[PDB]
Design a protein around this ligand. Structure first.
Ligand code: CL
Ligand code: CL
Ligand code: CL
Ligand code: CL
Ligand code: CL
Ligand code: CL
Ligand code: CL
Ligand code: CL
Ligand code: CL
Ligand code: CL
Ligand code: NA
Ligand code: NA
Ligand code: NA
Ligand code: NA
Ligand code: NA
Ligand code: NA
Ligand code: NA
Ligand code: NA
Ligand code: NA
Ligand code: NA
Lengths: 500, 500
């Protein structure tokens, strides 16, 4: 169940007799009230119709009108929210409607609210799929990160949200709500870890977080490998990234065995660069505070595990979090260094700011021992991905078409979308080095793709895919600056489908 | 009277019996309802008190709660707006309160609203001064620029705003409202001219706008000088700016004689660079669309005249709008050119992007013929002013301390503030040229000041001041991108005081 201060219930009772602090109804733009709103209007003797006739609420998506006590209702307030003029909403409009409702309710002193929104239609979504989107939007919309504020906002009075559904849909709605709550809990852990400042959130801290998660979930086993063990394993490019920082690196291994021992596991590999200065290839100063989000890949592995552990899915899951801090220093890796990866391939490190792939490639080699049926790495890897796909769609590459399709489908269902980019063999020659087996960077052309090509050289032994979340893992500026928790919804949906 | 679709009335009637679509009341945070709100609450039998006790409205500045029909009231709706917990508001909080009220009313279908806000106290402001700020904020908040949108917003239903005031204050409130309406009308003309795209708003267009203003106001006389006349006058630096563009330059002269012929006039000189590419000293591409705001100086002279003409102030006023377009071309002015200004001083044009001062200096020489008692130039002159003072405070320089103080005081009253920067003689040597009498730019140090020093060399014959509005004339980005209309409120207030 959701942990962020909200209980979500599903009930099949009549809205017009439900006791609640706020009853929420949808109002169309220039079309008749839906069945639920009409039943409530009838119960009040036409009071809602009479208000709407006065014209303050045009009915555009997300517009609101709040009424107090109406005759013959047990609702203390009635919140009208506009649903536009279309027969069906798209996902974006449904989310906008839900967020407008939540924003209003947050500011009220009501301890609960009941959503009578079952008459809304959303393109391509039945009861379960609508509940997944609605509850995830509501629950994630409650997220707060204020532990470093001396002045904290007043706690919400709102503590309970009831979804009204016809009895024939209530089981699907309940299922969707339960899954959405687990996803939102995972997103909240991901966002917390992403938002923590890098002087607190370093690799050792992430190791202790993993141990704490195992304390909470007896089904989770955790092992944390330090720099001595990494050197024993021959993890040369991983160590090269870490060596310039005072902070020691960590390889965190999470294991959950929800299925029979004969089922091959799915492996999630997360880039956990807790801060990325670029190293000797130093980044510019402007906006470099957002490099604390360079561990959002690893954070999303935490969050996906958190959701899976709550749902107790019948799957075998492994998490590999490759965490290091990338700092300049008198002992840092230099451009031109050549290192031997755990696979034995030598890499010429042309640019020390292309370091995510250097911790990932050793983790991908490590993943071979699990004989996985799928391996997915998640990383804030290339600014080129933002040029290619922006901030709303993650880049996706892989060496197996069926797995890539499974991830695309999961992202569509989750409304946490990705988009495939090709790993054509012609791109690989961009990584040729006169000195070593591989150069760690290509040119300025196709940067997201050549990063995927680099990783692919370590993933040939299994079905593998790669999510570039450089654009989707956080919001850069404004009031809403901070980690997003993506791609936890995509990944959790992928695993939900693999668990059937 | 305000021309943008709003009637402003002042009335001294009881709020609790006033017929209106929406009655607006202030609610303090954690302090008793004020006298007006308490009288309305009493009339409803405690209905407003009873709602507030439920806690939906914390009372923070600008928070709102909208009620429908309440017992025994003639108001169709009651809008409660939070006024915070302080005894007195500052100007910023008063504006925020007013804007929140207006934003709510805009979205309602009510044709009018009545503001019962007389109990609000604002630091240092009596009835007249509060009405000046309130009505100007409301009227300017109604501004719309949509002539290039194919899809225009629905017209507002709100067409009338009534300010309720005690009979002892109603004359002061009425005076403040009348002046604020004239200022807002002037701001709207300024903002229109600033927001027009530069392929429409060129110097010839501004000349026709001046002629149109004289058609509307019989007290205004207008003369428009073309490039032939400028060359006859010897206006060499003005012509040098204009010569690279296909668009001919214009010197627009506005004259209003509201006082006896023995009163020396006040002169406003406006920089009207209708687009500034930098010329041969070409600007970078990023954000260069905002260079259509490089005529906001001249636009503010239009707007100040528009307000003065409506108020029929007993003063003699002259406007000089120096308008040109600054373009690269095969005949454009080159860095290193030396030109002879109308004053006879030679200027070495080191950078063709410091062109505002080159049209202004010839206009300042031209102003000598009016034997003025004050000359104020207004210009979007230096990006250095934004570094120095940001986007909320205009830079102010001058050669006469009394005039500078008068302008500072006017800006404080108007809440359209400026701040003096010094024209110490030591800064002048930055404009030394080995070849000419003056260089048109100093170094990278004290750029706002050295621009003022350059202009001061043309203003020695009269009391003069210079407003750098590079930061305050427009908003750069976001939903509210566009011209602001500043410093029309400061300038109009200055002239209101000079008219007493
Ligand atoms: Cl169903
Ligand atoms: Cl640890
Ligand atoms: Cl250690
Ligand atoms: Cl985007
Ligand atoms: Cl799916
Ligand atoms: Cl008074
Ligand atoms: Cl003209
Ligand atoms: Cl001409
Ligand atoms: Cl600022
Ligand atoms: Cl004043
Ligand atoms: Na719609
Ligand atoms: Na949509
Ligand atoms: Na990097
Ligand atoms: Na990185
Ligand atoms: Na390239
Ligand atoms: Na206050
Ligand atoms: Na204030
Ligand atoms: Na310029
Ligand atoms: Na300019
Ligand atoms: Na300098």
């Amino acid at each position: 169940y959701f942990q962020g201060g909200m209980e979500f219930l599903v009930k099949s009772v009549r809205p017009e007799t439900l006791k609640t602090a706020t009853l929420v109804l949808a109002v169309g733009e220039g079309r008749k009230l839906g069945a639920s709103a009409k039943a409530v209007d009838d119960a009040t003797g036409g009071a809602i119709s009479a208000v709407l006739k006065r014209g303050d609420l045009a009915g555009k998506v997300g517009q609101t009108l709040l009424l107090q006590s109406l005759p013959n209702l047990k609702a203390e307030r009635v919140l009208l929210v506009g649903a536009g003029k279309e027969r069906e909403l798209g996902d974006r409009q449904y989310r906008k409607l839900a967020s407008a409702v939540l924003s209003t309710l947050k500011g009220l002193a009501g301890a609960d609210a009941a959503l009578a929104l079952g008459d809304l239609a959303v393109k391509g979504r039945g009861a379960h799929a609508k509940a997944r989107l609605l509850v995830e939007t509501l629950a994630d919309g409650l997220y707060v990160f204020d532990r470093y504020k001396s002045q904290k906002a007043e706690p919400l009075k709102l503590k309970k949200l009831t979804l009204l559904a016809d009895k024939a849909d209530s089981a699907a709605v309940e299922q969707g709500s339960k899954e959405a709550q687990a996803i939102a809990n995972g997103m909240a852990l991901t966002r917390d870890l992403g938002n923590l400042p890098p002087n607190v959130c370093h690799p050792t801290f992430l190791g202790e977080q993993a141990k704490g998660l195992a304390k909470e979930f007896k089904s989770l086993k955790v092992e944390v490998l330090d720099e001595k063990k990494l050197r024993e394993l021959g993890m040369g490019s991983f160590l090269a990234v870490a060596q310039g920082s005072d902070q020691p690196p960590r390889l965190i291994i999470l294991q959950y065995n929800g299925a029979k021992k004969d089922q091959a596991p799915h492996v999630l590999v997360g880039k956990g660069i807790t801060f990325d200065t670029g190293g000797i290839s130093l980044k510019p100063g402007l906006g470099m505070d957002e490099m604390k989000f360079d561990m959002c890949g690893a954070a999303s592995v935490f969050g996906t595990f958190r959701a899976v552990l709550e749902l107790q899915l019948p799957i075998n899951l492994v998490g590999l979090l490759a965490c290091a801090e990338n700092m300049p220093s008198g002992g840092a890796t230099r451009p031109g260094d050549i290192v031997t990866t755990m696979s034995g391939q030598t890499v010429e490190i042309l640019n020390t700011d292309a370091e995510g792939r250097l911790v990932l490639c050793d983790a991908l080699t490590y993943a071979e021992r699990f004989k996985p049926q799928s391996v997915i790495d998640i990383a804030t890897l290339t600014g080129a991905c933002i040029v290619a796909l922006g901030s709303n769609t993650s880049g996706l590459m892989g060496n197996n078409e069926a797995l890539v399709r499974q991830l695309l489908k999961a992202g569509e269902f989750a409304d946490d979308r990705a988009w495939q980019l090709p790993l054509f063999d012609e791109y690989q020659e961009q990584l040729d080095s006169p000195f070593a087996d591989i150069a760690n960077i290509g040119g300025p052309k196709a940067g997201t793709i050549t990063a995927g090509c680099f990783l692919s050289r370590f993933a040939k032994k299994y079905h593998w895919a790669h999510l570039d979340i450089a654009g989707t893992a956080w919001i850069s500026g404004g009031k809403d600056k901070g980690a997003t928790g993506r791609p936890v919804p995509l990944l959790t949906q992928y695993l939900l489908e693999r668990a059937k």
